[PDB]
Amino acid sequence: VKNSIIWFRKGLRLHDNPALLEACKDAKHVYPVFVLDPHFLQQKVSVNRYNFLLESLEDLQRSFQARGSRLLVLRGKPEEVFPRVFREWGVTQLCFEHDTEPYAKVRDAAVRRLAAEAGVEVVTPISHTLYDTDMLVARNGGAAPLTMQSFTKLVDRVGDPPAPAPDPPAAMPPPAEDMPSAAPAATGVPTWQEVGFKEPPLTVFKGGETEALARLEAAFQDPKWVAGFQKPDTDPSAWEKPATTVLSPYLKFGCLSARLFHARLLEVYRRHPAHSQPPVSLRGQLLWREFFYTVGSTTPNFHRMAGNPVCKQIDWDDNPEFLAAWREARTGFPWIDAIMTQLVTWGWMHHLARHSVACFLTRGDLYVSWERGMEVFEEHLIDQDHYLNAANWMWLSASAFFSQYFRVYSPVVFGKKYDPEGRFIRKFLPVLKDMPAKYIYEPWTAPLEVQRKAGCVVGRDYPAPIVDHAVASKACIARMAAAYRRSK
Ligand SMILES: Cc1cc2nc3c(=O)[nH]c(=O)nc-3n(C[C@H](O)[C@H](O)[C@H](O)COP(=O)(O)OP(=O)(O)OC[C@H]3O[C@@H](n4cnc5c(N)ncnc54)[C@H](O)[C@@H]3O)c2cc1C
Numbered sequence: 001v002k003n004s005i006i007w008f009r010k011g012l013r014l015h016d017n018p019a020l021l022e023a024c025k026d027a028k029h030v031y032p033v034f035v036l037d038p039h040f041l042q043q044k045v046s047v048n049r050y051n052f053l054l055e056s057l058e059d060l061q062r063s064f065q066a067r068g069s070r071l072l073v074l075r076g077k078p079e080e081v082f083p084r085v086f087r088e089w090g091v092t093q094l095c096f097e098h099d100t101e102p103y104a105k106v107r108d109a110a111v112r113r114l115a116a117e118a119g120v121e122v123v124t125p126i127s128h129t130l131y132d133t134d135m136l137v138a139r140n141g142g143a144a145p146l147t148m149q150s151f152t153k154l155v156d157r158v159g160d161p162p163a164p165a166p167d168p169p170a171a172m173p174p175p176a177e178d179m180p181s182a183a184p185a186a187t188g189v190p191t192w193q194e195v196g197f198k199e200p201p202l203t204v205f206k207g208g209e210t211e212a213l214a215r216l217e218a219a220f221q222d223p224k225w226v227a228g229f230q231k232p233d234t235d236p237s238a239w240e241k242p243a244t245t246v247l248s249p250y251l252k253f254g255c256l257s258a259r260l261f262h263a264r265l266l267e268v269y270r271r272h273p274a275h276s277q278p279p280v281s282l283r284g285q286l287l288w289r290e291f292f293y294t295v296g297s298t299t300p301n302f303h304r305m306a307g308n309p310v311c312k313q314i315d316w317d318d319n320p321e322f323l324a325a326w327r328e329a330r331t332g333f334p335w336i337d338a339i340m341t342q343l344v345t346w347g348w349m350h351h352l353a354r355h356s357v358a359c360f361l362t363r364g365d366l367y368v369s370w371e372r373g374m375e376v377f378e379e380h381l382i383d384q385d386h387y388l389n390a391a392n393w394m395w396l397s398a399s400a401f402f403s404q405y406f407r408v409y410s411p412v413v414f415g416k417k418y419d420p421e422g423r424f425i426r427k428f429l430p431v432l433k434d435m436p437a438k439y440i441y442e443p444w445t446a447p448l449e450v451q452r453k454a455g456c457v458v459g460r461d462y463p464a465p466i467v468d469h470a471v472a473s474k475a476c477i478a479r480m481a482a483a484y485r486r487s488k
């Protein structure tokens with residue numbers, strides 16, 4: 001008889017899940033599995049992101065229970081767990097969604113070898129990306145496009161991505177009873193307290209497929225907003241109602257299918273002939289993700305500077321004091337510090353808020369390596385995504401993809417154009433809540449009488465600025481110019 005495992009890693013959803021559909025086909029028993037390394041922390045990861053994963057697993061558990069089944073959260077390393085459960089459960093087929101990250105390729109090769117030793121068929125459909133990204137490279141002559149313009153031309157020659165797969169059946173084949181490795185007490189979803197976090201998550205975005213689909217429907221309630229979306233024109237200071245979809249955490253974990261999102265976009269576009277086009281359109285945003293997955297997966301050492309063939313070698317400074325001030329939201333520039341507080345509190349900030357703080361750290365003011373900023377984002381972002389974090393940090397530091405290092409955002413002026421009253425600053429830096437708007441982006445310029453009346457004395461309640469932007473940005477531009485000459 002057929003006994004199958006559907007192994008979740010990403011792809012934390014029932015919709016558009018061809019791996020799950022294959023596992024269920026003609027099966028007597030299906031074992032839905034997630035493998036949790038219970039020593040992960042004792043090795044880097046904020047409770048915000050880890051709890052988002054746990055909420056996503058709890059949602060899957062509820063969905064499987066509604067269909068007569070159960071999610072099994074196995075503790076250990078895949079290479080140690082799977083040989084045991086292959087034999088225990090009489091497994092004949094293992095299904096999982098393909099993953100192109102570096103660690104995944106090593107892990108999955110090991111599991112494939114073990115499956116073959118046990119006589120287990122392995123099925124690995126592509127559904128985390130819009131397309132088979134190896135197919136895109138092949139149809140481009142064997143190399144990934146290195147500009148968005150050429151990437152968009154390639155996908156348009158290839159055509160539409162595959163349609164989302166059908167929903168799974170209303171009843172699933174359950175795990176077999178009295179299998180020791182499937183014991184309830186050994187296979188439940190843990191809480192954040194149980195995995196060892198001491199402080200609670202503070203983010204406002206809840207994990208899981210159910211929430212992902214609800215947020216998708218909310219975005220599409222206004223088709224004119226979807227059709228006319230232009231990413232560069234959206235407001236980074238909007239926090240009560242964010243100005244973009246905030247689907248990124250859901251896409252990162254696969255709670256939302258990218259193919260479903262794309263299909264829904266095309267439905268709207270067919271009815272709105274003046275809809276925006278790539279790169280600025282909402283379809284364009286999914287193509288930025290696809291572009292960076294395609295380049296990233298075919299480039300060695302993509303997450304590093306040294307040994308990375310697409311990355312310019314730049315003389316970044318090893319300045320721990322500047323990195324600490326940035327990481328701890330005590331730069332003395334309220335726009336920067338508010339965004340860095342949103343990072344640690346919510347784990348998500350608007351794209352142009354990410355631009356502001358990444359420019360400041362690297363080529364704009366402090367001249368610290370983008371790899372250090374990437375590490376801080378990797379800890380705190382609930383949408384942390386290996387290829388997308390690396391690629392956008394290389395863009396913002398003018399190390400790859402982007403080369404216009406004379407464009408430097410002002411940490412004072414940039415936010416003021418959207419939010420002159422500083423509502424965003426006041427929300428995330430309440431020490432400044434009573435500062436008059438005239439000084440809230442530049443509090444060190446307020447007279448002492450004003451600082452005292454506001455209960456915010458610079459140097460006592462809120463730090464002085466760690467640099468003078470005019471001085472620092474001129475120095476950084478000169479160094480970038482010199483670095484660009486050296487790589488001639
Ligand atoms: C320094 C830096 C680091 C970043 N790190 C990450 C990261 O770890 N994870 C991440 O998902 N995005 C990252 N981004 C890209 C981008 O800022 C986010 O995808 C975006 O803020 C998510 O908001 P949203 O879902 O509302 O996006 P929308 O504008 O609604 O876009 C829809 C989807 O398109 C994709 N997308 C949008 N913008 C980009 C982009 N510039 N690059 C790649 N894909 C994009 C995402 O999957 C996103 O959910 C980073 C950008 C910068 C400047």
Ligand SMILES: [Cl-]
Nearest residue numbers: 409410413414
């Ligand atoms: Cl600016």
